[PDB]
Amino acid sequence: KARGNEYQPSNIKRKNKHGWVRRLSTPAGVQVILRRMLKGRKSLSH
């Protein structure tokens, strides 16, 4: 019956899923950081 409440915030999940260490863990994630660095993102990751 609830709508639009997909987000159930969890800091452990947020860091583990999208964190800095997670991004560096694989080459694709490292390229994610590189793209954001190129674009000049203020936040490269969570």
Is position 28 an interface residue for RNA (rule: CB under 7 A)? no
Residue closer to RNA, measured from CB, 17 or 35:
17
8 near RNA, rule: CB under 7 A: yes
User: How many residues sit close enough to RNA to count as binding (CB under 7 A)?
Assistant: 27
16 binds RNA (CB under 7 A): yes
Distances (CA, A) of 37 to 6, 20, 41: 29, 13, 6
Please say whether the beta carbons of 29 and 23 come within 8 A: yes
Task: Point out which residues bind RNA (CB under 7 A).
Answer: 1-22, 24, 43-46
